[PDB]
Amino acid sequence: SNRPVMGIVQDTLTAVRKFTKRDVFLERGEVMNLLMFLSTWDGKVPQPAILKPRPLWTGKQIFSLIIPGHINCIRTHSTHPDDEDSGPYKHISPGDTKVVVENGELIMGILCKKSLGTSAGSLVHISYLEMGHDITRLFYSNIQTVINNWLLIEGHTIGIGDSIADSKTYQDIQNTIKKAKQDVIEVIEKAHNNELEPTPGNTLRQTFENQVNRILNDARDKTGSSAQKSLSEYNNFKSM
């Protein structure tokens, strides 16, 4: 399928997604600790993104140090709004969800599995084609080592606090379940009294079965959507 098969595996992927966010800043000591693990580092500490108040490197600078040679790719983050490229801010992403790697340096964007994974046209595939293949081996090794060693400082977990929504969300879920259950019951009482009419193409029992499955699938989808609007951006399920 003319695509890479290696990709970036789970934990390194999550740690690099959290790493390349816009609000990630690194102290000088942490920057030196991270740059110690780059095999392809020429020994020059980059100019910080923040100089005067607290010299503070952004993680995107370290990842640009990772990215080899001078490769250029444009990808989209997994949560990139589809209505973002229509109106304004199509080049200055408010969500930082537009991955642009330019002249071998990560300009912007958060690297999900659609940037570093096994999808065709990803960063690793272009690194394989534009650069060599030993260089891509170095790229994989550097990503793994330095992102794990930053994950030591950051830390990533999952717990029972990541599986609990606030009481308003629970009330919404229970209200939706009750409404769908009552709807199924009234569909049943329509079916008993022969007031249900058969859909053209199948029997009455299946017009009924199609109705019940449709209502229950709508309930499942609505409850799932109402549940996944309440992660508060720190939920580790959402992180993964």
Binding site: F25, I92, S93, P94
Partner: protein, 148 residues
């Protein structure tokens, strides 16, 4: 001496469509006089910017006032007098896009320069007479300083 742009802006909006990141927020600012928009990502933790502030913003090709044109390496021991001592928030980044209201027949009037400071994005939409010093894929500084 090496300054590409200098203007006084006024903070009008802080991330009006919600706060995407807790440590960095974008400021929708208007110029005091030049009638230009500036959308700027700033670290709120180390440098809090409140709504309604007024600040000077000076894009400079280099911090050294002689225009010595450093490469961009981190030199914390260089005691050459830089312009950063006049300011309080210095961001170094590369300008990656200069789009503008242009036509295939006549010139561009309103330019829009895009610059990324590591990952912190800044769009400067102004007139071509003020954004003429910007060049695509060059290295610039920020030099913002709030004032009453």
């Amino acid at each position: 001496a090496g300054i590409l742009f200098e203007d006084i802006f006024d903070v009008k909006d802080i991330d009006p469509e919600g706060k995407k990141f807790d440590r960095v927020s974008r400021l929708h600012c208007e110029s005091e006089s030049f009638k230009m928009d500036l959308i700027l990502d700033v670290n709120i933790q180390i440098y809090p910017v409140d709504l309604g502030d007024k600040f000077r913003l000076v894009i400079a090709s280099t911090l050294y006032e002689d225009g010595t044109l450093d490469d961009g390496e981190y030199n914390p021991t260089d005691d050459r007098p830089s312009r950063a001592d006049q300011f309080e928030y210095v961001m170094y980044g590369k300008v990656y896009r200069i789009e503008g209201d242009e036509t295939s027949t006549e010139a561009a009037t309103r330019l829009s320069a895009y610059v990324s400071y590591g990952g912190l994005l800044m769009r400067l939409q102004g007139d071509a007479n003020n954004l003429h010093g910007f060049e695509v894929d060059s290295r610039v500084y920020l030099l913002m300083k709030k004032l009453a």
